[PDB]
Design an enzyme around this catalytic site. Structure first.
Site, PDB file in Angstrom:
ATOM      1  N   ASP A  77      -1.489 -12.956   5.558  1.00 18.18           N
ATOM      2  CA  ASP A  77      -2.541 -12.265   4.819  1.00 18.18           C
ATOM      3  C   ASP A  77      -3.779 -12.062   5.674  1.00 18.18           C
ATOM      4  O   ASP A  77      -4.672 -11.300   5.304  1.00 18.18           O
ATOM      5  CB  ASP A  77      -2.951 -13.033   3.555  1.00 18.18           C
ATOM      6  CG  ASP A  77      -1.831 -13.153   2.561  1.00 18.18           C
ATOM      7  OD1 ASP A  77      -1.181 -12.139   2.259  1.00 18.18           O
ATOM      8  OD2 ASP A  77      -1.580 -14.268   2.095  1.00 18.18           O
ATOM      9  N   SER A  79     -12.496  -6.440   6.238  1.00 26.34           N
ATOM     10  CA  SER A  79     -11.359  -5.580   5.939  1.00 26.34           C
ATOM     11  C   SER A  79     -10.677  -5.135   7.209  1.00 26.34           C
ATOM     12  O   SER A  79     -11.334  -4.882   8.210  1.00 26.34           O
ATOM     13  CB  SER A  79     -11.779  -4.343   5.147  1.00 26.34           C
ATOM     14  OG  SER A  79     -10.641  -3.520   4.885  1.00 26.34           O
ATOM     15  N   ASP A 127      -6.285  -3.640  -4.532  1.00 27.11           N
ATOM     16  CA  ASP A 127      -7.641  -4.113  -4.199  1.00 27.11           C
ATOM     17  C   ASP A 127      -8.605  -2.921  -4.071  1.00 27.11           C
ATOM     18  O   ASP A 127      -9.470  -2.912  -3.190  1.00 27.11           O
ATOM     19  CB  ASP A 127      -7.597  -4.942  -2.898  1.00 27.11           C
ATOM     20  CG  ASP A 127      -8.901  -5.646  -2.582  1.00 27.11           C
ATOM     21  OD1 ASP A 127      -9.605  -5.970  -3.543  1.00 27.11           O
ATOM     22  OD2 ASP A 127      -9.197  -5.916  -1.379  1.00 27.11           O
ATOM     23  N   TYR A 137      -1.883   2.212   0.884  1.00 29.65           N
ATOM     24  CA  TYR A 137      -2.965   1.211   1.052  1.00 29.65           C
ATOM     25  C   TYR A 137      -3.835   1.529   2.256  1.00 29.65           C
ATOM     26  O   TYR A 137      -3.764   0.842   3.269  1.00 29.65           O
ATOM     27  CB  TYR A 137      -2.355  -0.192   1.183  1.00 29.65           C
ATOM     28  CG  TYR A 137      -3.335  -1.347   1.270  1.00 29.65           C
ATOM     29  CD1 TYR A 137      -4.442  -1.454   0.406  1.00 29.65           C
ATOM     30  CD2 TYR A 137      -3.133  -2.374   2.193  1.00 29.65           C
ATOM     31  CE1 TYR A 137      -5.335  -2.550   0.496  1.00 29.65           C
ATOM     32  CE2 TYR A 137      -4.008  -3.464   2.273  1.00 29.65           C
ATOM     33  CZ  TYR A 137      -5.089  -3.540   1.424  1.00 29.65           C
ATOM     34  OH  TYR A 137      -5.934  -4.612   1.529  1.00 29.65           O
ATOM     35  N   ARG A 162     -12.037   0.287   2.686  1.00 28.47           N
ATOM     36  CA  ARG A 162     -11.029  -0.500   1.963  1.00 28.47           C
ATOM     37  C   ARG A 162     -11.540  -1.916   1.685  1.00 28.47           C
ATOM     38  O   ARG A 162     -12.336  -2.476   2.459  1.00 28.47           O
ATOM     39  CB  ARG A 162      -9.736  -0.550   2.787  1.00 28.47           C
ATOM     40  CG  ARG A 162      -8.471  -0.579   1.936  1.00 28.47           C
ATOM     41  CD  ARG A 162      -7.224  -0.568   2.809  1.00 28.47           C
ATOM     42  NE  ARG A 162      -7.085  -1.811   3.572  1.00 28.47           N
ATOM     43  CZ  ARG A 162      -6.201  -1.970   4.545  1.00 28.47           C
ATOM     44  NH1 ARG A 162      -5.383  -0.973   4.866  1.00 28.47           N
ATOM     45  NH2 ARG A 162      -6.158  -3.120   5.209  1.00 28.47           N
ATOM     46  N   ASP A 163     -11.097  -2.488   0.568  1.00 23.94           N
ATOM     47  CA  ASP A 163     -11.345  -3.904   0.283  1.00 23.94           C
ATOM     48  C   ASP A 163     -12.843  -4.177   0.239  1.00 23.94           C
ATOM     49  O   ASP A 163     -13.353  -5.101   0.884  1.00 23.94           O
ATOM     50  CB  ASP A 163     -10.652  -4.795   1.334  1.00 23.94           C
ATOM     51  CG  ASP A 163      -9.223  -4.381   1.579  1.00 23.94           C
ATOM     52  OD1 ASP A 163      -8.391  -4.546   0.659  1.00 23.94           O
ATOM     53  OD2 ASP A 163      -8.916  -3.936   2.716  1.00 23.94           O
TER      54      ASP A 163
END
Length: 362
Positions: free
Chosen positions: A315, A97, A137, A85, A90-91
């Site tokens: 999270d 992110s 994601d 990940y 990313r994201d």
């Protein structure tokens, strides 16, 4: 070289020492003896180990060496569960992110270097089996979030990075499941066909290795595997749980040239009907630990129910002033105050234990 059948079959699942430490520390803060004992049960439930920053790659060597030692001492074959990940940008559809690599600052090459570091650890320990979830994601954004400029900018890198990871990990005999969103993301009828096309294309471009076993769903999410009554948040989507999603998607994947298998996260799925909006993902309040990891699944297409996101790890922060603050973490149905993403969130863990379904035994 690949072996036939379900890659989980016959393996003891290595228990994350990272998570066990966290759970032991958490139980130490719980005063009620019965609740403390229930919390301690959690460290016996296998989770996936996340490699969300490149600084963690040497920890893979440590876990593989430990699984190797356990296998040698006990004679029981070990399987280590990991998450890859760290894509650049990313994201891409997210408000913020935490990803350390940016395409503007050599992110594509840094990502390849991150994968190479993981591979160098795996090369040291060939006698243990690894199952990897590839890039939560990421590619799911190409199906539904191409309206987002950052996602259009990241498409080539996501495909390149996922293909590089799959080729590198398949060369080492790792069994991979590519992230494929969840029922509320890719399960909408309009999204099924473009999803099947995209994931079949990735399988093709990654070389069709049988080590590319299939797809992972519900990662870090809260959807039911199979609900008797739909969650009101799912209104309009006929595919209102993960089994419905997978049953709708799997035939299309097969038509597109890939007989994909699936694993499904149920780690935080114990309590349904806890969201105002289906896209609310951050520290959703009142979640419970869900169905225990098992190979007794409701479909031949599903290899395993697993716990991918380790419940108790935040999270995202609820501090609106924090550099990496995501507005999702300030929703009315998010548990607050919450610490930085990936760090321990004691109150949230306590609720996961209290709300576990099936309940935790002492």
């Amino acid at each position: 070289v690949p072996s036939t059948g379900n890659p989980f079959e016959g393996y003891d699942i290595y228990l994350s020492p990272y998570y066990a430490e966290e759970v032991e520390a958490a139980a130490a803060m719980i005063d009620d003896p019965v609740l403390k004992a229930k919390a301690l049960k959690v460290k016996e439930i296998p989770t996936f180990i996340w490699f969300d920053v490149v600084r963690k790659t040497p920890d893979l060597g440590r876990y593989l060496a430990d699984a190797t030692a356990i296998q040698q001492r006990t004679g029981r074959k070990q399987l280590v569960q990991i998450v890859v990940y760290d894509l650049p940008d990313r994201d891409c559809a997210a408000a913020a992110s935490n990803g350390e690599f940016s395409l503007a600052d050599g992110g594509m090459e840094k990502y390849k270097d991150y994968v190479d570091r993981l591979a160098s650890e795996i090369r040291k320990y060939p006698d243990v089996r690894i199952v990897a979830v590839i890039e939560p994601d990421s590619l799911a954004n190409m199906v539904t979030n191409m309206n987002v400029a950052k996602c259009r900018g990241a498409e080539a890198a996501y495909k390149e990075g996922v293909i590089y990871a799959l080729r590198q990990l398949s060369a080492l005999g790792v069994y991979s499941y590519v992230d494929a969103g969840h029922a509320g993301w890719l399960g909408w009828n309009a999204n099924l066909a473009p999803s099947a096309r995209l994931f079949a294309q990735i399988y093709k471009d990654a070389g069709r290795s049988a080590f590319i076993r299939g797809l992972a769903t519900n990662v870090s999410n809260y959807n039911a595997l199979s609900a008797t009554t739909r969650d009101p948040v799912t209104q309009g989507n006929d595919n209102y749980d993960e089994l419905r999603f997978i049953n709708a998607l799997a035939p299309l994947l097969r038509n597109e040239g890939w007989d994909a298998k699936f694993i499904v996260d149920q780690g935080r799925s114990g309590v349904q009907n806890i969201r105002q909006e289906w896209g609310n993902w951050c520290n959703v309040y009142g979640a419970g630990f869900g169905m225990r990891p098992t190979l007794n699944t409701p479909s031949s297409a599903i290899d395993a129910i697993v716990w991918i996101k380790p419940g108790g790890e935040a999270d995202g922060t609820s501090d609106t002033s924090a550099p990496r603050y995501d507005t999702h973490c300030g929703k009315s149905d998010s548990h607050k105050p919450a610490p930085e993403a990936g760090t321990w969130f004691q109150e949230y863990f306590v609720n996961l234990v209290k709300n576990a379904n099936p309940p935790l035994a002492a």
